[PDB]
Write a protein that binds this ligand. Structure first.
Ligand SMILES: O=C(Nc1cc(S(=O)(=O)Nc2ccc(OC(F)F)cc2)ccc1Cl)c1cc(F)cc(F)c1
Ligand SMILES: O=C(Nc1cc(S(=O)(=O)Nc2ccc(OC(F)F)cc2)ccc1Cl)c1cc(F)cc(F)c1
Lengths: 542, 542
């Protein structure tokens, strides 16, 4: 009842006198370790596996035995563990090794349970739930169906590690509305709904029931949508954003993190926000959302007219530079960033990225294209003609889909390029000077939004709370971090980052009078201190 | 409290109506499987791992979630799983991956706990314990120290699978008396007693305390010694055999299994027991013990004078044929099987195995040598001169240390060789006729001895109970099994084998009046039926 409770079990960290007092003497080998020592031991155990999937499999077993030791190990090696415990290992574990998620507490919904969603939640037996991560396995970018539960599980664990959401107060959810994965539909071992994905009407009937049931049974929870397909993810936020406490990390988290890093890149370049000429390579709804979040943040931090900031952006879709004179009927999201200042004759000659870069003379390249390595040596050399400090953000993943490697960006600019990446890269050394890209990891924002929304209990999560989290992250990058060319505070300091982000999100909910928790301080120093004490810490407490 | 109890959890085998009644609807994906279906699914999950250690790691996770499903999967694929869940994977898991044993209920003794052994056992909180497996990690043949707990864990699991010892009524024990493994003594992550192995006096002080404490606190238990070094294993049985309910599977189990197979090989050869000329290649205490167990069994089943059976054996040590005229002072165990009928002049010319085989004209080669492939093509061709059906038992392991491969034995004899192995081998086909060696697996005997000693509660385990188990195993090989060239009943029928072995061991304890359980039937048909009902079965019961 001590050893077998993964929440209170300490394993070898039980002193000899504790083992005696708890009648577990002789249930453990005789060595007594501190948590630090146990973490070093577990880290060496992880590294005796070569494959990410087998390292994850080891970490699952640690979590099942000693939950405190699992979270202490992740926090001590966060940069290295992140790719094992979430993207991209988690999706490979869901797709081929879904059994690794079987022992993790989760909630499974489908049409068979229509009208029982509320009863199912009550029966799950949680106390004051703070965070719920829901997916349908459809994927923001391999349809996983029911096996998407592993995405919710991995994401919930990042709230616990990143912001000290208590691990008892977070719920991973799969809404199984079927799967278009043909292998799964024929697989004898697929345990989900063995049918193609429901149409929109039935999809919203079940997701409406989910939202309404959760708001009744888990009224203190933030509902975070994860890894929903583009046919639904934007429409879900339009349907629920005002009615329920909810956000989508893929859309809103991404834009908040990228905007924060990008404004710090502007500060380092010397080329001020109204002097930037920004090629946005990629014109999907998400890419335009990131551009708009950049504009919104620059407007908040600097009070430039947002219209003037919109005119710094040159949007490139699969046809070429998006302009009002190009001759096609533009998708709604592309109209706002369409150039009005380019002639029909010029638009016809602005198709290839190299000729667009030659014409626009950009100072920034934002890679949101999800195509090849489009930022060629020739394109980077042209940007060097327009600024002493090119900003180059190859943000498409996987690393193969990325517009340019940080190493190539630094080599071709002889260390001038200011780079943020979607993925971790090793440092690059040029002439004895070391350069390393700043990783725009989503972990910078969602945990702090979760912890802030958990504490403040806002009626909903308006765009003002995401913009505040974005600004808070930008302002955590110290003069020193900036002097060393970092665009973000260090990932390893995620607890301090989360507490600061949460504090600023709470102060914004307080300014809008949407906060329902009147116990919280209303001044930043006292609130920050209160938020730090509220966080769950992977240390042996009792 | 249902899902999280690995003893009552059924996972997807909970029907929709059970899930509703137990308030776990939505804690599982929607598919409902039978146990057979769950087993087929788990089997495919095992086989998506290439390495034995990662297959074992998967099976550990199954055992932690759904104990019934773990044991059902092992029994459905026993031949294939045995090398993963015990020798040789288990020793590799102990040596390099000891963390795979951390979550398994076990008891850890060392000198730090002197005089507290009884209190430690009471505190472990077991009910009417039936089987205890103890090791010191010294190895019958890489010193594992404390990591030897994994050997006890693996062996206990074979009692549960093989004889339906209830998994709640078995205890794995490590007596940590230190380690001479120099890597471990320097390893920061070794959790055991970081000192060289205790001398004999302190070793017996602690092992005496263990035996006396267990006999008081676990009075219904059989104590089985596993994987003790040769400096101690024989002396332990001399010290405890009459005083406590105990046996050593390496010594006594091996001899019982090999004797049973060997007598069936004699039946198939037509060359009757007094006409056999047996080369025993290898003259350690164990090898001589196997020869003596063969003699004892032939004397019991056929009432030949044991002296006449002893004269069928030609013992070969590292010097050559063991004889009274050779000129050396023979070790005690070698004297009994020493030839009296070979001259000093002949002994001097009986050194190499090829010249010994040429002189002795044996009909059997027993490989207990632990050296190379000593049974050469030339030696096998000579045995073909002496019998139409050579008996060739390459019993040394690993498979590299074996005296000859079954394939070579069958090829060189053109399918005449009668072969038993220490390890599983694929079938060999010669001229459209298929041959496959009979594996002398220890699983044939120890589980049935454990189940018989659990039921009968004998005051001790005299050699008569092992000889009875040996005979019982021999007699389970059906006329049909024999017509197909099998020396043992099929491994997959281990439950029936264990119930028969246990029944015969109980009837022998009853004949000697050492049985303490007066509830048992005293006639074979009624007792066999009673023993089958007593066994734990990996099926969903409630
Ligand atoms: O706490 C237990 N054992 C233990 C823990 C530790 S530890 O907690 O100090 N480290 C540890 C842990 C699990 C891990 O993961 C993967 F290997 F099991 C990795 C490291 C070390 C050594 C032992 Cl024997 C324990 C828990 C039970 F529920 C039942 C039981 F029988 C034992
Ligand atoms: O029973 C649980 N889950 C489950 C079981 C099964 S199963 O029992 O039918 N098969 C199964 C099992 C474990 C395995 O091993 C290795 F993968 F976990 C392999 C197969 C299938 C699918 C699910 Cl979600 C469960 C148990 C808990 F203690 C907590 C919890 F949240 C869920």
């Amino acid at each position: 009842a001590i050893l077998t409770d993964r929440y209170i079990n300490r394993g070898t960290a039980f002193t000899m006198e504790e083992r005696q007092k708890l009648h577990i003497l002789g249930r453990l080998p005789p060595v007594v370790e501190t948590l630090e020592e146990q973490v070093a031991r577990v880290y060496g155990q992880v590294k005796k596996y070569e494959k990410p999937i087998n390292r994850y499999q080891h970490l699952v077993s640690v979590h099942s035995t000693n939950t405190t030791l699992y979270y202490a190990t992740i926090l001590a090696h966060l940069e290295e563990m992140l790719p094992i415990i979430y993207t991209p290992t988690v999706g490979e574990a869901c797709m081929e090794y879904s059994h690794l998620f079987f022992r993790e507490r989760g909630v499974y919904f489908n049409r068979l349970y229509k009208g029982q969603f509320r009863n199912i939640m009550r029966d799950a037996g949680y106390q004051k739930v703070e965070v719920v991560v829901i997916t349908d396995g459809s994927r923001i970018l391999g349809d996983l169906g029911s096996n998407g539960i592993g995405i919710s599980i991995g994401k919930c664990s990042l709230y616990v590690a990143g912001a000290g959401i208590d691990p008892r107060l977070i719920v991973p959810v799969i809404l199984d509305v079927g799967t278009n994965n043909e292998r799964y539909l024929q697989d004898k071992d697929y345990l989900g709904m063995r049918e193609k994905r429901l149409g929109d009407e039935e999809f919203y009937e079940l997701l409406d029931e989910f939202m309404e049931a959760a708001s009744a049974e888990w009224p203190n929870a933030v509902i975070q949508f994860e890894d929903f397909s583009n046919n639904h993810c934007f429409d879900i936020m339009e349907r629920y954003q005002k009615k329920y406490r909810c956000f989508n990390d893929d859309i809103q988290g991404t834009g908040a993190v990228i905007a924060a890093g990008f404004l710090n890149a502007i500060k380092l370049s010397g080329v001020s926000p109204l002097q930037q000429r920004i090629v946005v390579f990629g014109a999907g709804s998400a890419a335009v959302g990131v551009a708009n979040n950049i504009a919104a943040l620059a407007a908040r931090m600097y009070k430039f007219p947002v219209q003037d900031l919109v005119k710094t952006f040159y949007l490139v879709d699969t046809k070429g530079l998006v302009t009002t004179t190009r001759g096609d009927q533009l998708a709604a999201h592309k109209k706002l960033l369409a150039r009005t200042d380019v002639s029909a004759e010029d638009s016809a000659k602005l198709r290839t990225l190299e000729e667009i870069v030659r014409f626009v003379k950009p100072t920034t390249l934002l890679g949101l294209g999800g195509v090849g390595p489009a930022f060629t040596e020739e394109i980077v050399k042209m940007v060097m003609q327009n600024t002493e400090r090119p900003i180059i953000f190859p943000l498409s993943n996987p690393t193969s889909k990325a517009e340019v490697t940080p190493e190539n960006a630094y080599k071709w600019t002889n260390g001038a390029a200011i780079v943020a990446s979607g993925s971790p890269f090793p440092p690059t050394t040029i002439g004895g000077k070391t350069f390393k890209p700043s990783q725009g990891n989503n972990l910078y924002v969602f945990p702090g939004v979760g912890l802030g929304c958990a504490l403040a209990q806002p009626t909903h999560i308006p765009e003002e709370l995401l913009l505040t989290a974005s600004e808070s992250l930008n302002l955590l990058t110290t003069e020193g971090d900036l002097r060393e060319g970092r665009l973000y505070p260090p990932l390893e300091d995620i607890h301090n980052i989360s507490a600061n982000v949460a504090t600023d999100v709470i102060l914004e909910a307080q300014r809008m009078k949407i906060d329902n928790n009147k116990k919280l301080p209303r001044t930043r120093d006292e609130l920050l201190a209160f938020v730090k004490k509220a966080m769950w810490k992977p240390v042996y407490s009792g």
